[PDB]
């Protein structure tokens, strides 16, 4: 690849996210990515998934990713795969706060603190992990050595 030559993906066709949500909805997902088709699928809990679409595709341009609950693990796996749009039903503020700093497409349905527990009484292991790191790539490296 070219270091000169740079894609710019920046927006979503507003009818493949609708396509997108219906197949989302209609299998209870918990991740999915979709360009026209359904490329990856999944239903398992916490970031398996994410590391398995991670370790599937080298990038996702020309399409777009949906997730469940977006925290900051998944945010820099999620942007270093370079999807045109994230739609993340639930995101945590870090990850939002991510997500404008790299000026990626992202859109959410409700926005909380951090990413939760198993309990929903406390922070998310992985979220309390990486909370105070700066770096997606530096993030992406210590999750994968914890699987
Ligand atoms: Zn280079
Ligand atoms: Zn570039
Ligand atoms: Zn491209
Ligand atoms: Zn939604
Ligand atoms: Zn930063
Ligand atoms: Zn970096």
């Known amino acids: 690849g070219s270091d000169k030559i740079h894609h710019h993906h ?6 493949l996210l609708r396509s997108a949500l219906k197949i989302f909805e209609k299998k209870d997902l918990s991740l999915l990515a979709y360009s026209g088709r359904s490329i990856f699928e999944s239903k398992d809990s916490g970031l398996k ?5 991670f370790k599937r595709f080298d990038n996702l341009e020309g399409s777009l990713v949906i997730d469940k609950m977006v925290g900051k693990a998944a945010a820099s796996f ?3 795969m370079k999807p045109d749009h994230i739609h993340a039903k639930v995101i945590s503020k870090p990850a ?3 997500m404008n700093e790299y000026g990626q497409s992202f859109s ?4 909380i603190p951090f990413v939760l527990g198993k309990d929903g009484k406390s922070m998310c292991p992985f979220e309390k992990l990486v909370l105070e790191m700066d770096d997606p790539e530096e ?3 210590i ?3 914890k699987f």
């Not at 998934?49 to 679409?53: D, I």
């Open 10 to 15: 920046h927006h979503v066709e507003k009818n």
């Open 49 to 53: 998934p994410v590391v398995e679409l």
């Open 78 to 80: 999620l942007l270093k």
């Open 96 to 98: 939002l706060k991510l």
């Open 108 to 111: 959410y349905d409700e926005k």
């Open 139 to 141: 993030i992406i490296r």
């Open 143 to 145: 999750v994968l050595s």
